[PDB]
Amino acid sequence: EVGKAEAERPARFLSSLWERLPQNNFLKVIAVALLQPPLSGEGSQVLVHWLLGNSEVFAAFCRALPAGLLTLVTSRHPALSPVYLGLLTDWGQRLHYDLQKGIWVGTESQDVPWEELHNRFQSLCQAPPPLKDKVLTALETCKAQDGDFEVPGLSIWTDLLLALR
Amino acid sequence: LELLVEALNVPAPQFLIEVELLLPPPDLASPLHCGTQSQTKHILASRCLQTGRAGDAAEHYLDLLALLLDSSEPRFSPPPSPPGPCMPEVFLEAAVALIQAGRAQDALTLCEELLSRTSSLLPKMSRLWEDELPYCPLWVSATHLLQGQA
Numbered sequence: 619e620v621g622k623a624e625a626e627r628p629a630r631f632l633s634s635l636w637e638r639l640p641q642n643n644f645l646k647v648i649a650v651a652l653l654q655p656p657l658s659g660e661g662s663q664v665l666v667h668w669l670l671g672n673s674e675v676f677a678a679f680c681r682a683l684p685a686g687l688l689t690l691v692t693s694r695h696p697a698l699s700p701v702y703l704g705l706l707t708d709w710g711q712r713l714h715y716d717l718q719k720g721i722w723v724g725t726e727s728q729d730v731p732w733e734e735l736h737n738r739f740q741s742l743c744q745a746p747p748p749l750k751d752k753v754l755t756a757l758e759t760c761k762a763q764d765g766d767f768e769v770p771g772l773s774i775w776t777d778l779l780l781a782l783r
Numbered sequence: 784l785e786l787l788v789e790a791l792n793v794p795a796p797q798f799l800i801e802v803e804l805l806l807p808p809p810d811l812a813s814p815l816h817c818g819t820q821s822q823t824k825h826i827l828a829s830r831c832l833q834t835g836r837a838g839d840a841a842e843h844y845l846d847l848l849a850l851l852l853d854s855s856e857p858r859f860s861p862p863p864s865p866p867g868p869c870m871p872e873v874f875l876e877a878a879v880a881l882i883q884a885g886r887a888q889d890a891l892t893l894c895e896e897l898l899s900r901t902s903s904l905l906p907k908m909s910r911l912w913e914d915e916l917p918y919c920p921l922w923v924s925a926t927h928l929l930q931g932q933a
């Protein structure tokens with residue numbers, strides 16, 4: 619209706635929404651909205667422009683949902699692959715290893731744990747061919763940037779690539 | 784000690800009561816405790832290594848190792864006894880001298896031959912994927928430390 623009207627852009631509406639209603643609820647709606655096959659997908663095509671436009675909300679999205687949801691988000695809308703991967707890259711690089719418990723852990727309390735990060739890459743790989751190659755190459759590149767070790771306890775990203783067998 | 788070793792290189796019972804019959808076999812605390820060739824050569828190399836005559840030490844230690852392992856043909860030539868160090872603590876001391884020579888490409892043909900014989904023990908490190916419980920004898924952790932310094 620607002621699209622046909624063309625008086626205000628969906629942006630303004632979704633900005634006001636963002637303040638007004640409960641966010642966890644909201645996001646799941648939006649997530650699922652991206653997937654519903656078309657009813658007149660201009661709808662889905664609008665939401666990706668809103669999201670990629672406003673970074674801050676999209677950071678909470680990837681953080682709030684499950685893994686399979688973001689997997690299907692991506693394979694449908696390739697406009698989401700490269701920035702999502704971008705957010706994982708950026709979370710992995712604020713960890714650190716302790717030797718005494720054999721585990722990657724974050725400094726800060728809110729820093730997506732190893733558990734969570736394993737899982738999402740687990741999924742992203744467990745996906746169709748046009749994304750698996752993309753992501754797997756985005757690992758080998760951030761590995762080499764942080765030293766090509768072939769042993770655990772150095773490169774978060776070596777760790778992961780190993781942990782996928 | 785050098786002289787000692789060559790000494791130990793070279794080797795009758797009366798139907799009567801002689802003294803040695805009544806003499807005991809001596810202990811390890813005795814000053815009449817003298818080991819064997821191999822056991823001593825080890826002392827020499829050991830003693831040498833503590834002084835900082837690393838090169839010499841090495842050669843001693845290699846001669847040690849030659850003796851211990853290569854002795855298939857003649858009379859056996861034994862390892863050091865276990866108030867002393869075990870057969871892997873030794874190889875390490877071999878490789879450590881070889882490092883104080885600056886003979887690092889040898890020190891590695893040693894730590895290679897070591898972990899080659901002893902594959903068929905080791906901890907097969909699947910905890911590598913799952914990461915207190917599994918067992919690593921200190922010496923296997925260390926071989927890796929010195930491979931590294933090499």
Ligand SMILES: [Zn+2]
Pocket residue numbers: 868869870871872922
């Ligand atoms: Zn030992």
